[PDB]
Amino acid sequence: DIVMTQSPGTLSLSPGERATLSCRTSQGVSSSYLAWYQQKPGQAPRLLISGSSSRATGIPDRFSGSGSGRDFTLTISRLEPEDSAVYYCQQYATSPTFGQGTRVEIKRTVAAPSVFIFPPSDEQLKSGTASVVCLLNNFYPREAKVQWKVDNALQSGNSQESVTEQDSKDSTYSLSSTLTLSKADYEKHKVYACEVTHQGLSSPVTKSFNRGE
Amino acid sequence: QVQLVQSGAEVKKPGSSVRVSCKASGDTFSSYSITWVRQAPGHGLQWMGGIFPIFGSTNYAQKFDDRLTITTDDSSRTVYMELTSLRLEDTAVYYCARGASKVEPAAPAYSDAFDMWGQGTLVTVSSASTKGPSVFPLAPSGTAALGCLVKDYFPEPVTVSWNSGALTSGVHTFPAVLQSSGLYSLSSVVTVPSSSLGTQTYICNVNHKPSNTKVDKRVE
């Protein structure tokens, strides 16, 4: 078997800059037997290039393939925003093998999030659980910090977050931190805040609420 | 749109066996080869096997030579994968895909580039049993934010839309997290301007397939 090795792991470049991706094989493969794929979040992969350098139909000129032997390359000659994605090489000379992908991350100037805190719905409280949600909307970069506090008591170990993939239009991230409590605890306390710390913020932002309206 | 359409995702107890369907266009079914590539965290895109319906010939990867078997149904041009004695590691998205070459007189290159792909079938190999979510309003207080908390289901996945498709701009359907409880929890939001909460009413359209759950929940 042949082992596709892609490098680097992530590529962070601005639109209009050139991307070049490396895919190395564990042994020599002819140019005819190589494919490149593109996977954007939550989709199948699209064939971009087959036989080292033949563009599949409908694929833009800014993708080209090259190399031979044990070193093959895809160059996105000038990145679009919409080229934020992961990308896989495949040998099909023998038994098909794929690399583990390169992620391209589209650079952008700093964007502070806009923050939104949601208290628990009554229909869930009538069910015995209490889920408070806090949204960080359209920020860049990906490095952000969400610290729940309940009546200035800092939370830990009770909150989970998940992050939407880099938008293909405005290249930002959005996150969703969720403090979870029992219906019991949720009534023993009154000042439910969510404090955000991101590069775009002069100092940490706090949204909050009270159990009122 | 010369497409490939697949069966729904499933949860399967270990040691069991799942089968995933792959239904084609007729053109594809006559003159091309259909492959099964699976993708899971930690070892990525993994070739499994491929079938040439016009010949009925198969070639699987060594990794699966006994647990895997690929079969067609010419009556409706559906290809079938069946992976047997499921292991934990099998859990993945299984894709079907058209090989790039059209069939040749002398033949068959099972090793091939993959032209066209289906939409994905997520096989959870889990001892846990199905559970439908409980959706809950995410209610607002000049742009506002609202959503729906699709809390407490299994397996993956659920889908989320807004106004049965009519609302899409500003919609953030987050990736599911897996709780300490062992069930999944998800969150969709959408931003709209405050002026429209007098005008427009907003419903999310939650759909969790393997439990056969569908919910439409309006938001304040």
Side-chain angles (χ1 to χ4, degrees), chain A residues 53-112:
Chain A
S53 65
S54 341
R55 269 180 289 112
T57 88
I59 294 300
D61 328 58
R62 64 187 188 268
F63 298 89
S64 95
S66 50
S68 65
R70 278 182 66 192
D71 273 299
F72 305 84
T73 294
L74 174 87
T75 78
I76 309 161
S77 49
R78 339 204 169 194
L79 292 160
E80 299 286 303
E82 57 162 19
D83 296 325
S84 171
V86 175
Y87 297 83
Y88 304 84
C89 57
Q90 178 215 338
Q91 164 266 297
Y92 48 90
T94 83
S95 321
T97 88
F98 300 74
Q100 72 300 338
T102 294
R103 180 174 275 91
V104 160
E105 183 194 43
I106 294 290
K107 279 176 148 53
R108 169 173 209 295
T109 50
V110 170

Coordinates of all heavy atoms in Angstrom, one line a residue, chain A residues 53-112:
Chain A
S53 N -3.0 16.4 -13.1 CA -3.4 17.8 -13.5 C -4.6 18.0 -14.5 O -4.5 19.0 -15.2 CB -2.1 18.3 -14.1 OG -1.8 17.5 -15.3
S54 N -5.6 17.2 -14.6 CA -6.7 17.4 -15.4 C -7.9 17.9 -14.6 O -8.4 17.2 -13.7 CB -7.1 16.2 -16.2 OG -6.1 15.2 -16.2
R55 N -8.4 19.1 -14.9 CA -9.5 19.6 -14.1 C -10.8 18.9 -14.5 O -11.1 18.7 -15.6 CB -9.7 21.1 -14.4 CG -9.0 22.0 -13.5 CD -9.2 23.5 -13.8 NE -8.6 23.8 -15.1 CZ -9.2 24.1 -16.2 NH1 -10.5 24.1 -16.3 NH2 -8.4 24.4 -17.3
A56 N -11.5 18.4 -13.4 CA -12.9 17.9 -13.6 C -13.7 19.1 -14.2 O -13.4 20.2 -14.1 CB -13.4 17.4 -12.3
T57 N -14.9 18.7 -14.8 CA -15.7 19.6 -15.4 C -16.3 20.6 -14.4 O -16.5 20.3 -13.2 CB -16.9 18.9 -16.1 OG1 -18.0 18.7 -15.2 CG2 -16.5 17.6 -16.6
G58 N -16.4 21.9 -14.8 CA -17.0 22.9 -13.9 C -16.0 23.4 -12.9 O -16.5 24.2 -12.0
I59 N -14.8 23.1 -12.9 CA -13.8 23.4 -11.9 C -13.0 24.6 -12.3 O -12.5 24.6 -13.4 CB -12.8 22.3 -11.5 CG1 -13.6 21.1 -10.9 CG2 -11.7 22.7 -10.7 CD1 -14.3 21.5 -9.6
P60 N -12.9 25.7 -11.5 CA -12.3 26.9 -12.0 C -10.8 26.8 -12.3 O -10.0 26.0 -11.8 CB -12.4 27.9 -10.8 CG -13.5 27.3 -10.0 CD -13.4 25.8 -10.2
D61 N -10.3 27.7 -13.2 CA -9.0 27.7 -13.7 C -8.0 28.0 -12.5 O -6.8 27.7 -12.7 CB -8.8 28.9 -14.7 CG -10.1 29.1 -15.5 OD1 -11.2 29.3 -14.9 OD2 -10.0 29.0 -16.7
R62 N -8.4 28.5 -11.4 CA -7.5 28.9 -10.3 C -6.9 27.6 -9.6 O -6.0 27.8 -8.8 CB -8.1 29.8 -9.3 CG -9.3 29.2 -8.6 CD -9.9 30.3 -7.8 NE -10.9 29.9 -6.9 CZ -12.2 29.8 -7.2 NH1 -12.7 30.2 -8.4 NH2 -13.1 29.4 -6.3
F63 N -7.5 26.5 -9.8 CA -7.0 25.2 -9.3 C -6.2 24.6 -10.5 O -6.6 24.5 -11.6 CB -8.1 24.3 -9.0 CG -9.0 24.7 -7.8 CD1 -10.1 25.5 -8.1 CD2 -8.7 24.4 -6.5 CE1 -10.9 26.0 -7.0 CE2 -9.5 24.8 -5.5 CZ -10.6 25.6 -5.7
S64 N -4.9 24.2 -10.1 CA -4.1 23.5 -11.1 C -3.4 22.4 -10.3 O -3.1 22.5 -9.1 CB -3.1 24.4 -11.8 OG -1.8 24.4 -11.2
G65 N -3.0 21.3 -11.0 CA -2.3 20.3 -10.4 C -0.9 20.1 -11.0 O -0.8 20.5 -12.2
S66 N 0.1 19.5 -10.3 CA 1.4 19.3 -10.9 C 2.1 18.3 -10.1 O 1.5 17.7 -9.2 CB 2.2 20.7 -10.9 OG 2.1 21.3 -9.7
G67 N 3.4 18.1 -10.4 CA 4.2 17.1 -9.7 C 4.2 15.8 -10.5 O 3.5 15.6 -11.5
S68 N 5.0 14.9 -9.9 CA 5.3 13.6 -10.5 C 6.2 12.8 -9.6 O 7.0 13.4 -8.9 CB 5.9 13.7 -11.9 OG 7.2 14.3 -11.8
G69 N 6.1 11.5 -9.6 CA 7.0 10.6 -8.9 C 6.5 10.3 -7.5 O 5.7 9.4 -7.3
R70 N 7.0 11.0 -6.5 CA 6.5 10.9 -5.1 C 6.1 12.3 -4.5 O 5.8 12.3 -3.3 CB 7.5 10.3 -4.2 CG 7.6 8.8 -4.2 CD 8.6 8.2 -3.2 NE 8.2 8.5 -1.8 CZ 9.0 8.3 -0.8 NH1 10.3 7.9 -1.0 NH2 8.6 8.5 0.5
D71 N 6.0 13.3 -5.3 CA 5.6 14.7 -4.9 C 4.6 15.3 -5.8 O 5.0 15.6 -7.0 CB 6.8 15.6 -4.7 CG 7.4 15.5 -3.3 OD1 6.7 15.7 -2.3 OD2 8.6 15.1 -3.2
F72 N 3.4 15.5 -5.3 CA 2.3 16.1 -6.1 C 1.8 17.3 -5.4 O 1.8 17.4 -4.1 CB 1.3 15.1 -6.4 CG 1.8 13.9 -7.1 CD1 2.3 12.8 -6.3 CD2 1.8 13.7 -8.4 CE1 2.8 11.7 -6.9 CE2 2.2 12.6 -9.0 CZ 2.8 11.6 -8.3
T73 N 1.3 18.3 -6.1 CA 0.9 19.6 -5.6 C -0.4 20.0 -6.3 O -0.6 19.9 -7.5 CB 2.0 20.6 -5.9 OG1 3.1 20.3 -5.1 CG2 1.5 22.0 -5.5
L74 N -1.2 20.6 -5.5 CA -2.4 21.4 -6.0 C -2.1 22.9 -5.6 O -1.7 23.2 -4.5 CB -3.6 21.0 -5.3 CG -4.9 21.8 -5.6 CD1 -5.6 21.3 -6.8 CD2 -5.8 21.7 -4.3
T75 N -2.2 23.8 -6.6 CA -2.0 25.2 -6.3 C -3.4 25.9 -6.6 O -4.0 25.7 -7.7 CB -0.9 25.9 -7.2 OG1 -1.4 26.1 -8.5 CG2 0.4 25.0 -7.2
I76 N -3.9 26.6 -5.6 CA -5.0 27.5 -5.8 C -4.4 28.8 -6.0 O -4.0 29.5 -5.1 CB -5.9 27.5 -4.5 CG1 -6.2 26.1 -4.2 CG2 -7.2 28.3 -4.8 CD1 -6.7 25.8 -2.8
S77 N -4.3 29.1 -7.3 CA -3.4 30.2 -7.7 C -3.7 31.5 -7.0 O -2.8 32.3 -6.7 CB -3.4 30.4 -9.2 OG -4.8 30.4 -9.7
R78 N -5.0 31.8 -6.9 CA -5.4 32.9 -6.0 C -6.8 32.6 -5.3 O -7.8 32.5 -6.0 CB -5.5 34.2 -6.8 CG -4.7 34.3 -8.1 CD -4.4 35.8 -8.5 NE -3.4 35.8 -9.6 CZ -2.7 36.8 -10.0 NH1 -2.8 38.0 -9.3 NH2 -1.9 36.7 -11.0
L79 N -6.7 32.5 -4.0 CA -7.8 32.0 -3.2 C -9.0 32.9 -3.3 O -8.9 34.1 -3.4 CB -7.4 31.9 -1.7 CG -6.4 30.9 -1.4 CD1 -5.8 31.2 -0.1 CD2 -7.0 29.5 -1.3
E80 N -10.2 32.3 -3.4 CA -11.4 33.0 -3.2 C -11.8 32.8 -1.7 O -11.3 31.9 -1.0 CB -12.5 32.3 -4.0 CG -12.3 32.4 -5.5 CD -12.6 33.8 -6.0 OE1 -13.7 34.3 -5.7 OE2 -11.7 34.4 -6.6
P81 N -12.6 33.7 -1.1 CA -13.3 33.3 0.1 C -13.8 31.9 0.1 O -13.5 31.1 0.9 CB -14.3 34.4 0.3 CG -13.7 35.6 -0.4 CD -13.0 35.0 -1.6
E82 N -14.7 31.6 -0.9 CA -15.4 30.4 -1.0 C -14.5 29.1 -1.0 O -15.0 28.0 -0.9 CB -16.3 30.4 -2.2 CG -15.6 30.6 -3.5 CD -16.4 30.2 -4.7 OE1 -17.7 30.0 -4.5 OE2 -15.9 29.9 -5.8
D83 N -13.2 29.3 -1.2 CA -12.3 28.1 -1.2 C -11.9 27.7 0.3 O -10.9 26.9 0.4 CB -11.0 28.5 -2.0 CG -11.3 28.6 -3.5 OD1 -12.2 28.0 -4.0 OD2 -10.6 29.4 -4.2
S84 N -12.5 28.3 1.3 CA -12.3 27.8 2.7 C -12.9 26.4 2.8 O -14.1 26.2 2.7 CB -13.0 28.7 3.6 OG -13.0 28.2 4.9
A85 N -12.0 25.4 3.1 CA -12.4 24.0 2.9 C -11.2 23.1 3.3 O -10.1 23.6 3.6 CB -12.7 23.7 1.4
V86 N -11.4 21.8 3.3 CA -10.4 20.8 3.4 C -10.3 20.0 2.0 O -11.3 20.0 1.3 CB -10.6 19.8 4.5 CG1 -9.5 18.7 4.5 CG2 -10.5 20.5 5.8
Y87 N -9.1 19.5 1.7 CA -8.7 19.1 0.4 C -7.9 17.8 0.5 O -6.9 17.7 1.3 CB -7.8 20.2 -0.2 CG -8.5 21.5 -0.5 CD1 -8.7 22.4 0.5 CD2 -9.1 21.8 -1.7 CE1 -9.4 23.6 0.3 CE2 -9.8 22.9 -2.0 CZ -9.9 23.8 -0.9 OH -10.6 25.0 -1.2
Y88 N -8.2 16.8 -0.3 CA -7.6 15.5 -0.2 C -7.0 15.0 -1.5 O -7.5 15.2 -2.6 CB -8.7 14.4 0.2 CG -9.4 14.8 1.5 CD1 -10.5 15.6 1.5 CD2 -8.9 14.3 2.8 CE1 -11.1 16.0 2.7 CE2 -9.6 14.6 4.0 CZ -10.7 15.5 3.9 OH -11.3 15.9 5.0
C89 N -5.8 14.4 -1.4 CA -5.2 13.7 -2.5 C -5.4 12.2 -2.5 O -5.6 11.6 -1.4 CB -3.7 14.0 -2.5 SG -2.8 13.4 -1.0
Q90 N -5.5 11.6 -3.7 CA -5.7 10.2 -3.8 C -4.8 9.6 -4.8 O -4.8 10.1 -6.0 CB -7.2 9.9 -4.1 CG -7.5 8.5 -4.2 CD -8.6 8.2 -5.3 OE1 -9.4 9.1 -5.6 NE2 -8.6 7.0 -5.8
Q91 N -4.1 8.6 -4.5 CA -3.5 7.7 -5.4 C -4.6 6.7 -5.9 O -5.3 6.2 -5.1 CB -2.4 6.9 -4.8 CG -1.9 5.7 -5.5 CD -2.6 4.5 -4.9 OE1 -2.4 4.1 -3.7 NE2 -3.3 3.8 -5.7
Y92 N -4.7 6.4 -7.2 CA -5.5 5.3 -7.7 C -4.7 4.5 -8.7 O -5.2 3.9 -9.6 CB -6.8 5.8 -8.3 CG -6.7 6.9 -9.3 CD1 -6.5 6.7 -10.7 CD2 -6.9 8.3 -8.9 CE1 -6.5 7.7 -11.6 CE2 -6.8 9.3 -9.8 CZ -6.6 9.0 -11.1 OH -6.5 10.0 -12.1
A93 N -3.4 4.4 -8.4 CA -2.5 3.5 -9.2 C -2.7 2.0 -8.8 O -2.7 1.2 -9.7 CB -1.0 3.9 -9.0
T94 N -2.8 1.8 -7.5 CA -3.1 0.5 -6.9 C -4.3 -0.2 -6.2 O -5.1 -0.9 -6.9 CB -2.0 0.1 -6.0 OG1 -2.3 0.7 -4.7 CG2 -0.7 0.6 -6.4
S95 N -4.4 0.0 -4.9 CA -5.5 0.1 -4.1 C -5.6 1.6 -3.7 O -4.7 2.2 -3.1 CB -5.3 -0.8 -2.9 OG -4.7 -2.0 -3.3
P96 N -6.8 2.2 -3.9 CA -6.9 3.7 -3.7 C -6.5 4.1 -2.3 O -7.0 3.5 -1.3 CB -8.4 3.9 -3.9 CG -8.8 2.9 -4.9 CD -7.9 1.7 -4.6
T97 N -5.7 5.1 -2.2 CA -5.4 5.7 -0.8 C -5.5 7.2 -0.9 O -5.2 7.8 -1.9 CB -4.0 5.2 -0.3 OG1 -3.0 6.1 -0.8 CG2 -3.7 3.8 -0.8
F98 N -6.0 7.8 0.2 CA -6.2 9.2 0.3 C -5.3 9.7 1.4 O -5.0 9.0 2.4 CB -7.6 9.5 0.7 CG -8.6 9.1 -0.3 CD1 -9.0 7.8 -0.4 CD2 -9.3 10.0 -1.1 CE1 -9.9 7.3 -1.3 CE2 -10.2 9.6 -2.0 CZ -10.5 8.3 -2.1
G99 N -4.9 11.0 1.3 CA -4.2 11.7 2.4 C -5.3 12.1 3.4 O -6.5 11.8 3.3
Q100 N -4.8 12.7 4.5 CA -5.7 13.1 5.7 C -6.1 14.5 5.6 O -6.7 15.0 6.5 CB -4.9 12.8 7.0 CG -3.8 13.7 7.3 CD -2.6 13.8 6.2 OE1 -2.5 12.8 5.4 NE2 -1.9 14.9 6.2
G101 N -5.9 15.1 4.4 CA -6.5 16.4 4.1 C -5.6 17.6 4.6 O -4.9 17.5 5.5
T102 N -5.7 18.7 3.8 CA -5.2 20.0 4.3 C -6.4 20.9 4.4 O -7.3 20.9 3.5 CB -4.2 20.6 3.3 OG1 -3.0 19.8 3.2 CG2 -3.9 22.0 3.6
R103 N -6.5 21.6 5.5 CA -7.5 22.7 5.7 C -6.9 24.0 5.2 O -5.8 24.3 5.6 CB -8.0 22.8 7.1 CG -9.0 23.8 7.4 CD -9.5 23.7 8.8 NE -10.6 22.7 8.9 CZ -10.4 21.4 9.2 NH1 -9.2 21.0 9.4 NH2 -11.5 20.6 9.3
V104 N -7.6 24.7 4.3 CA -7.2 26.1 4.0 C -8.2 27.0 4.9 O -9.4 26.8 4.9 CB -7.3 26.4 2.5 CG1 -7.5 27.9 2.3 CG2 -6.2 25.9 1.7
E105 N -7.6 27.9 5.6 CA -8.3 28.9 6.4 C -8.1 30.3 5.8 O -7.0 30.8 5.7 CB -7.9 28.9 7.9 CG -8.7 29.9 8.7 CD -8.2 30.2 10.1 OE1 -6.9 30.4 10.2 OE2 -9.0 30.3 11.1
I106 N -9.2 30.9 5.4 CA -9.2 32.2 4.7 C -9.0 33.3 5.8 O -9.8 33.5 6.6 CB -10.4 32.5 3.9 CG1 -10.5 31.4 2.8 CG2 -10.4 33.9 3.4 CD1 -9.5 31.7 1.7
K107 N -7.9 34.1 5.6 CA -7.6 35.1 6.6 C -8.5 36.3 6.3 O -9.1 36.5 5.2 CB -6.1 35.6 6.4 CG -5.1 34.8 7.2 CD -3.7 35.3 6.9 CE -2.8 35.0 8.1 NZ -2.9 33.6 8.5
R108 N -8.6 37.2 7.3 CA -9.5 38.3 7.4 C -9.1 39.2 8.5 O -8.4 38.8 9.4 CB -10.9 37.7 7.8 CG -11.9 38.7 8.1 CD -13.3 38.2 8.3 NE -14.1 39.4 7.9 CZ -14.1 40.6 8.6 NH1 -13.3 40.6 9.7 NH2 -14.8 41.6 8.2
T109 N -9.5 40.5 8.4 CA -9.2 41.4 9.5 C -10.1 41.1 10.7 O -11.1 40.4 10.6 CB -9.5 42.9 9.1 OG1 -10.8 43.0 8.5 CG2 -8.4 43.4 8.1
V110 N -9.7 41.6 11.8 CA -10.4 41.3 13.1 C -11.9 41.7 13.1 O -12.2 42.9 12.7 CB -9.7 41.9 14.3 CG1 -10.5 41.7 15.5 CG2 -8.3 41.2 14.5
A111 N -12.7 40.9 13.6 CA -14.2 41.1 13.8 C -14.6 40.7 15.1 O -14.7 39.5 15.4 CB -15.0 40.4 12.7
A112 N -14.9 41.7 16.0 CA -15.4 41.3 17.3 C -16.8 40.6 17.1 O -17.5 40.9 16.2 CB -15.6 42.6 18.2

